[PDB]
A and B are shown apart, each in its own frame.
With several copies, the nearest count.
Chain A
Amino acid sequence: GVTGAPKKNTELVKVMGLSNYHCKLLSPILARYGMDKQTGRAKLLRDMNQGELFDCALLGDRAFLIEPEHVNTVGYGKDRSGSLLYLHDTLEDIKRANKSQECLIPVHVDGDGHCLVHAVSRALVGRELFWHALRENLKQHFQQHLARYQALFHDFIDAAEWEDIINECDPLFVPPEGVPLGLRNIHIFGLANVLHRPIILLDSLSGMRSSGDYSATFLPGLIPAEKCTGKDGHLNKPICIAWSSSGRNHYIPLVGIKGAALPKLPMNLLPKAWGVPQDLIKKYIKLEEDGGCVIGGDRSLQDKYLLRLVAAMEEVFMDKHGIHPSLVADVHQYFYRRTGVIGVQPEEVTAAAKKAVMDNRLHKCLLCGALSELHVPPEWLAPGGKLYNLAKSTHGQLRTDKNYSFPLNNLVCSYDSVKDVLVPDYGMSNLTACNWCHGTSVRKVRGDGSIVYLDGDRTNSRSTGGKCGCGFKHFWDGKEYDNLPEAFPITLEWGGRVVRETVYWFQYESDSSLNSNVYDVAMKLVTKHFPGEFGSEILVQKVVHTILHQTAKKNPDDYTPVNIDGAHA
């Protein structure tokens, strides 16, 4: 099965476990939440008084630096699309300015129509985590300085447009039909002012000599230069962005390479100012003596801290959404992406998958990792449905006191008198073969992200060592064991009563404390089968003497694990 696992989309590719879609499920909450240095718990910005919306002015020192090993990643590192050929004319002077070294690169960004702030967030932290604050506070920044925005653009922009311009910053507001898929440069001007940082939008060599001002240097004109410096007294090195196509519909960020030379932007590739005097290039950019400017920077945040922050948001995301954002992401890929629709809203996937959470309708494949669901349209159980017809000729009348199990669908349905529908308890419903690869081992997924393993189920956690050969950990009685336990029966006689009971005897555990201890195994059985008998302490001695004589294996490596179908064959 070459195609039994769909290729992971740019929003779904997880770099260091981080995917764009997953970050999209955490970025809007970052707009009013922060990470704690002591507990690691998320904290509302109301308590740490950073405003209701995340102040992006602190992000002026943030420039993404790409590692060489993560360049090849689709959707995270280098974009593989036609923008690679597009910027070569610009890349001719990008490289040669820094002595013929690749210092500034295009970066792939999700094409959901809000890539402009997605790129800017990727320009700042390289993730889709700080983008959502870039718009909502920008709308407020437009409102606060609208009169000063009017001072420049009342003769270039219609007064009624500014009410629509602030509507452009709205997160999920879909503009009316016909609007080109992309945000205007007016946001970047505000964003450059919001970030207390210059922003540079590039184009090809033809783009610069094109008569359009769509490639320009966005300077923080509304913010004075002394406020446009970092905490060290130095001006923030600008983040750079580019046009990703000749149609001008997707934005890309231009970032440096982590550990490599700081990119330098030559004067011919440094575009003119956008809406502000040209002299502001000297005032707002840390300019060099050779006529160029330094791009990127070294005051960047290492990916180690951001990993906590993503985890710091998955914390509250438990309480707020009742579901895990990665669990939402897989539901998106396997059921929403199953329809082939590009651009599905993350919110709909979050809320609807909770229904699968509540009834345990998610059944995850244990071999290829496919997340399968036992989804049944409501009319299939209503009159006229498929399973509605079977109940009549297979088990007679619709009985309120009789449950209808459907082995073909593994649905056990009761008949509710008022609704005249057969109601399967999807907790009792179990997928037996995957609808992606027909793997027999397909198991439920809980809302906390925990998979409902069974006895003999092999978990995805790596085995640190074991005779099993499977290389993965095995799950047992609520615990994770490196190996599967030997089993052999026991024979109990007390008070004349006789019991068959099978004894599972773990051995060769990497951790010493998890190995079986006979004085607990023996006591468990007698208690489990003879609660409250007098003189059972004599029975335990007889039991212990048996197990020891049975586990006395001549060769210590005589390992004959339990025979469980599917896990091992």
Chain B
Amino acid sequence: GFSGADLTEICQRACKLAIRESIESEIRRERERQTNPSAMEVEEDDPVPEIRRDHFEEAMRFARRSVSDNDIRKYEMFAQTLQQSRGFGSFRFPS
């Protein structure tokens, strides 16, 4: 029953969880390298280049619903007010 504007949240709160895990490991790598500057170990390309499933498996824990169930049988009941005042489809031209 998710709205069209709470799938634009699941697809962003699942980016912050890959942004944060990038700066984290980017910083935490410089830490250990400065712990052993003589280690010389360089040319490390990237820790996370990719949204990397098990982000969505975590962003779904903060996924709410905008329109509750009662907020649907409020419009769907208004359609059957504009409707139900119609229905002459029984009309048929004789002969």
| Interface hub of A518, A532, A534, A551 (most chain B Cβ within 10 A) | A532
Interface pair B81/A534, CB less than 8 Å apart: no
Q: Establish whether residues B69 and A532, one from each chain, have CB atoms under 8 Å apart when the complex forms.
A: no
Shortest CB distance A526–B (Å): 8
Task: Check A519 against B70 for contact (C-beta < 8 Å).
Answer: no
Report chain B residues within 8 Å CB of A527: 70
Bound: A519/B84 CA distance, A:
11
- Bound-complex Cα distance A136 to B70 (A): 63
B80 at the A interface (CB under 8 A): yes
Residue of B nearest to A521 (CB): B77
Asked if B74 contacts A533 (CB within 8 A), the reply is yes
**Within 8 Å of chain B (Cβ to Cβ): is A556?**
yes
- The A537-569 residues at the B interface (CB cut-off 8 A) are 548, 551-553, 556
Chain B residue at minimal CB-CB distance from A520? B81
Q: Does B61 contact A (CB under 8 A)?
A: no
Say yes or no for A140: interface residue by CB 8 A criterion: no
Closest to B76 in A: A532
- State whether the Cβ of A460 lies closer than 8 Å to any Cβ in chain B: no
B74 near A534 with CB under 8 A, answer yes
* Residues of chain A contacted by B81 (CB below 8 angstroms): 517, 519-520
Q: Is the CB of A552 within 8 A of B77?
A: no
Q: Tell me the complex Cα distance, A348–B84, Å.
A: 50
* A517→B70 contact, CB < 8 A: no
Does B91 make an interface contact (CB < 8 A)?
no
What is the bound-complex CA distance between A533 and B73, given in angstroms?
Answer: 9
Report the separation of the CA atoms of residues A519 and B83 in the bound assembly, to the nearest whole angstrom: 12
Please tell me the size bucket of the interface on B. under 10
A531 within 8 A of B: yes
List A contacts of B74 (CB < 8 A): 518, 532-534, 548
Alpha-carbon gap, A527 to B78, bound state (A): 16
B70 contact set on A, CB distance < 8 A? 527, 531-532, 548, 551-553
CB pair A548–B73 under 8 Å, yes or no, is yes
Are B69 and A519 within 8 A (Cβ)?
A: no
Q: For chain A residues 510-527, which have a beta carbon within 8 Å of chain B?
A: 517-520, 527
B residues in contact with A552, CB < 8 Å:
70
* Complex Cα–Cα for A25 and B77 (A): 50
CA distance A90 to B73 in the complex (A): 74
CA distance A520 to B80 in the complex (A): 10
* Cβ < 8 Å to A, chain B residues 58-95: 69-70, 73-74, 77-78, 80-81, 84
Task: Please name all residues of chain B whose beta carbon is closer than 8 Å to the beta carbon of A519 when the two chains form the complex.
Answer: 77-78, 81
| Max chain A C-beta neighbours (<10 A), residue from B73, B77, B80, B84 | B77
Residues of A within 8 A of B78 (CB): 519
Of all chain A residues, which has the CB nearest B70?
A: A552
Residue of B nearest to A527 (CB): B70
**Do B77 and A517 have beta carbons less than 8 Å apart?**
yes
Chain B residues near A551 (CB-CB < 8 A): 70
How does the 8 Å CB contact mask read for B3-25 relative to A, with 1 for contact and 0 for none?
A: 00000000000000000000000
Interchain CA distance A199-B78 in the complex, whole Å: 71
Contact of B77 among A518, A553, A556 (CB under 8 A): A518
Chain A residues within an 8 Å CB radius of B84? 517, 520
Most buried by A among B73, B74, B84: B74
Chain B residues in 8 Å Cβ range of A556: 69
Chain B residues, CB < 8 A from A548? 70, 73-74
Chain B nearest Cβ from A543, distance in angstroms? 13
Residue with the highest number of chain A CB atoms closer than 10 Å, among B70, B78, B80, B84: B70
Which residues of A110-153 have CB atoms within 8 Å of chain B's CB atoms?
none
B69 and A517 contact, CB distance less than 8 A: no
C-alpha gap A553/B73 in the complex (Å): 12
In the complex, A552→B73 CA distance in Å? 10
In the bound assembly, the distance between CA atoms of A305 and B13 in angstroms comes to 49
Name B80's closest neighbour in chain A (CB-CB). A517
Least Cβ distance of A507 to chain B in Å? 10
Give the docked Cα–Cα distance between A518 and B79 (Å). Answer: 12
Binary CB contact string for chain B from 37 to 76 against chain A (1 if under 8 A, 0 otherwise):
0000000000000000000000000000000011001100
How many angstroms between the C-alpha atoms of A180 and B69 in the bound complex? 73
CB neighbours of B80 from chain A (8 A): 517
Q: Which residues of A contact B73 (CB under 8 A)?
A: 531-532, 548
Residues of B within 8 A of A534 (CB): 74
CA distance A527 to B69 in the complex (A): 10
Given contacts A518-B74, A532-B77, A548-B74, 7 further A-B contacts (CB under 8 A): A519-B77, A520-B84, A531-B73, A532-B73, A533-B74, A534-B74, A556-B69
**6 cross-chain pairs, A with B, having the tightest CB-CB distances, nearest first:** A519-B81, A552-B70, A532-B74, A532-B77, A527-B70, A517-B77
Which residues of A are interface residues toward B (Cβ below 8 A)? Answer: 517-520, 527, 531-534, 548, 551-553, 556
- Could you write out 27 A-B pairs with CB less than 8 Å apart? A517-B77, A517-B80, A517-B81, A517-B84, A518-B74, A518-B77, A519-B77, A519-B78, A519-B81, A520-B81, A520-B84, A527-B70, A531-B70, A531-B73, A532-B70, A532-B73, A532-B74, A532-B77, A533-B74, A534-B74, A548-B70, A548-B73, A548-B74, A551-B70, A552-B70, A553-B70, A556-B69
